[PDB]
PDB file of C-alpha atoms in Angstrom:
ATOM      1  CA  UNK R 417       5.563  -1.511   5.927  1.00 52.85           C
ATOM      2  CA  UNK R 418       6.161  -5.061   7.175  1.00 53.25           C
ATOM      3  CA  UNK R 419       7.707  -7.718   4.957  1.00 52.23           C
ATOM      4  CA  UNK R 420       7.099 -10.244   7.754  1.00 54.04           C
ATOM      5  CA  UNK R 421       6.041  -9.860  11.405  1.00 57.31           C
ATOM      6  CA  UNK R 422       8.320 -10.616  14.347  1.00 62.77           C
ATOM      7  CA  UNK R 423       8.965 -14.338  13.926  1.00 63.43           C
ATOM      8  CA  UNK R 424      11.058 -17.116  15.455  1.00 63.69           C
ATOM      9  CA  UNK R 425      13.360 -19.316  13.359  1.00 63.66           C
ATOM     10  CA  UNK R 426      14.866 -22.575  14.615  1.00 66.80           C
ATOM     11  CA  UNK R 427      18.592 -23.189  14.181  1.00 68.44           C
ATOM     12  CA  UNK R 428      20.630 -26.328  13.593  1.00 69.19           C
ATOM     13  CA  UNK R 429      21.281 -28.836  16.384  1.00 67.61           C
ATOM     14  CA  UNK R 430      25.049 -29.355  16.570  1.00 68.14           C
ATOM     15  CA  UNK R 431      24.879 -30.890  20.050  1.00 68.80           C
ATOM     16  CA  UNK R 432      22.851 -30.939  23.264  1.00 68.38           C
ATOM     17  CA  UNK R 433      22.191 -27.192  22.924  1.00 70.47           C
ATOM     18  CA  UNK R 434      18.945 -25.598  21.718  1.00 69.06           C
ATOM     19  CA  UNK R 435      19.300 -22.524  19.497  1.00 68.22           C
ATOM     20  CA  UNK R 436      16.935 -20.163  17.694  1.00 68.23           C
ATOM     21  CA  UNK R 437      16.804 -16.605  16.386  1.00 66.11           C
ATOM     22  CA  UNK R 438      14.146 -13.880  16.332  1.00 66.46           C
ATOM     23  CA  UNK R 439      13.878 -11.865  13.118  1.00 67.38           C
ATOM     24  CA  UNK R 440      11.909  -8.932  11.741  1.00 67.88           C
ATOM     25  CA  UNK R 441      11.949  -7.179   8.354  1.00 72.96           C
ATOM     26  CA  UNK R 442      10.433  -3.789   7.604  1.00 71.83           C
ATOM     27  CA  UNK R 443      10.861  -0.080   6.954  1.00 69.29           C
ATOM     28  CA  UNK R 444       8.924   3.073   7.955  1.00 70.23           C
ATOM     29  CA  UNK R 445       7.628   5.323   5.179  1.00 69.30           C
ATOM     30  CA  UNK R 446       5.991   8.748   5.505  1.00 67.19           C
ATOM     31  CA  UNK R 447       4.213   9.928   2.364  1.00 69.59           C
ATOM     32  CA  UNK R 448       3.892  13.673   3.145  1.00 69.55           C
ATOM     33  CA  UNK R 449       7.133  15.092   4.597  1.00 67.99           C
ATOM     34  CA  UNK R 450       5.577  18.568   4.936  1.00 66.03           C
ATOM     35  CA  UNK R 451       2.820  17.466   7.351  1.00 64.62           C
ATOM     36  CA  UNK R 452       5.352  16.867  10.152  1.00 64.35           C
ATOM     37  CA  UNK R 453       7.526  19.242  12.157  1.00 64.00           C
ATOM     38  CA  UNK R 454      10.028  19.141  14.997  1.00 65.35           C
ATOM     39  CA  UNK R 455      11.343  21.309  17.825  1.00 66.65           C
ATOM     40  CA  UNK R 456      15.103  21.352  18.396  1.00 67.41           C
ATOM     41  CA  UNK R 457      17.394  22.631  21.160  1.00 66.58           C
ATOM     42  CA  UNK R 458      14.815  22.461  23.953  1.00 68.19           C
ATOM     43  CA  UNK R 459      15.956  23.189  27.509  1.00 70.11           C
ATOM     44  CA  UNK R 460      14.382  21.347  30.449  1.00 67.61           C
ATOM     45  CA  UNK R 461      16.380  21.035  33.683  1.00 69.12           C
ATOM     46  CA  UNK R 462      13.914  18.871  35.632  1.00 63.28           C
ATOM     47  CA  UNK R 463      16.499  16.172  36.572  1.00 67.32           C
ATOM     48  CA  UNK R 464      18.457  18.817  38.488  1.00 66.20           C
TER      49      UNK R 464
ATOM     50  CA  UNK L  49     -42.128  20.788 -35.967  1.00 64.67           C
ATOM     51  CA  UNK L  50     -40.546  24.120 -37.009  1.00 60.44           C
ATOM     52  CA  UNK L  51     -40.402  25.218 -33.345  1.00 59.60           C
ATOM     53  CA  UNK L  52     -38.797  22.038 -31.969  1.00 61.27           C
ATOM     54  CA  UNK L  53     -35.111  22.361 -31.114  1.00 62.53           C
ATOM     55  CA  UNK L  54     -33.065  19.805 -33.095  1.00 62.44           C
ATOM     56  CA  UNK L  55     -30.361  17.831 -31.276  1.00 65.03           C
ATOM     57  CA  UNK L  56     -26.788  18.922 -31.927  1.00 61.08           C
ATOM     58  CA  UNK L  57     -23.191  18.069 -31.057  1.00 62.33           C
ATOM     59  CA  UNK L  58     -23.042  14.940 -33.227  1.00 62.47           C
ATOM     60  CA  UNK L  59     -20.068  16.122 -35.301  1.00 59.89           C
ATOM     61  CA  UNK L  60     -17.398  15.320 -32.690  1.00 55.99           C
ATOM     62  CA  UNK L  61     -16.234  11.833 -33.608  1.00 56.21           C
ATOM     63  CA  UNK L  62     -14.713   9.789 -30.760  1.00 57.06           C
ATOM     64  CA  UNK L  63     -16.380  11.761 -27.984  1.00 56.82           C
ATOM     65  CA  UNK L  64     -14.655  11.903 -24.597  1.00 57.95           C
ATOM     66  CA  UNK L  65     -17.674  10.462 -22.770  1.00 54.86           C
ATOM     67  CA  UNK L  66     -17.700   7.532 -25.193  1.00 55.97           C
ATOM     68  CA  UNK L  67     -13.990   6.976 -24.528  1.00 53.52           C
ATOM     69  CA  UNK L  68     -14.569   6.989 -20.761  1.00 50.31           C
ATOM     70  CA  UNK L  69     -17.425   4.489 -21.078  1.00 52.81           C
ATOM     71  CA  UNK L  70     -15.291   2.305 -23.357  1.00 50.71           C
ATOM     72  CA  UNK L  71     -12.467   2.348 -20.797  1.00 46.91           C
ATOM     73  CA  UNK L  72     -14.903   1.417 -18.026  1.00 45.91           C
ATOM     74  CA  UNK L  73     -16.229  -1.550 -20.017  1.00 46.27           C
ATOM     75  CA  UNK L  74     -13.150  -3.012 -21.718  1.00 43.61           C
ATOM     76  CA  UNK L  75     -10.758  -2.586 -18.746  1.00 43.17           C
ATOM     77  CA  UNK L  76     -12.487  -3.561 -15.496  1.00 46.86           C
ATOM     78  CA  UNK L  77     -10.630  -4.257 -12.251  1.00 42.93           C
ATOM     79  CA  UNK L  78      -8.048  -1.588 -13.106  1.00 41.82           C
ATOM     80  CA  UNK L  79      -6.225  -0.094 -10.142  1.00 40.80           C
ATOM     81  CA  UNK L  80      -7.014  -3.019  -7.837  1.00 42.01           C
ATOM     82  CA  UNK L  81      -4.460  -4.538  -5.461  1.00 41.66           C
ATOM     83  CA  UNK L  82      -3.935  -8.179  -6.457  1.00 41.22           C
ATOM     84  CA  UNK L  83      -0.426  -8.503  -4.984  1.00 40.90           C
ATOM     85  CA  UNK L  84      -1.778 -10.598  -2.096  1.00 43.01           C
ATOM     86  CA  UNK L  85      -2.811 -13.420  -4.460  1.00 42.31           C
ATOM     87  CA  UNK L  86       0.735 -14.139  -5.712  1.00 43.06           C
ATOM     88  CA  UNK L  87       2.518 -13.874  -2.349  1.00 41.62           C
ATOM     89  CA  UNK L  88       4.419 -16.980  -1.190  1.00 43.32           C
ATOM     90  CA  UNK L  89       4.728 -15.477   2.304  1.00 39.97           C
ATOM     91  CA  UNK L  90       3.206 -17.891   4.865  1.00 39.66           C
ATOM     92  CA  UNK L  91       2.260 -14.993   7.171  1.00 38.88           C
ATOM     93  CA  UNK L  92      -0.675 -13.026   5.735  1.00 40.27           C
ATOM     94  CA  UNK L  93      -1.592 -11.207   8.978  1.00 40.83           C
ATOM     95  CA  UNK L  94       0.056  -7.942  10.028  1.00 40.68           C
ATOM     96  CA  UNK L  95       0.965  -7.597  13.708  1.00 40.12           C
ATOM     97  CA  UNK L  96       3.072  -5.103  15.721  1.00 41.93           C
TER      98      UNK L  96
END
């Protein structure tokens, strides 16, 4: 759920420097917790 | 006609079907999402 997309906001000019910030608001929500699962403690020594 | 079946079931005042039809008529647009029409958010398009 997105309150606003990834946006750019301009900041104040206190001198010969240009400033701005990038912001994003949101949260992930899953409605059915029992329709997901996970595997834990998996071993895979492919790096070496 | 002595052999014609007379209609019945007229003794149940405030029938459930009548209540459902009344709800459908007197309360239209129920359960619709109108939140978008009072949003002061300039961005109305959802992007990743």
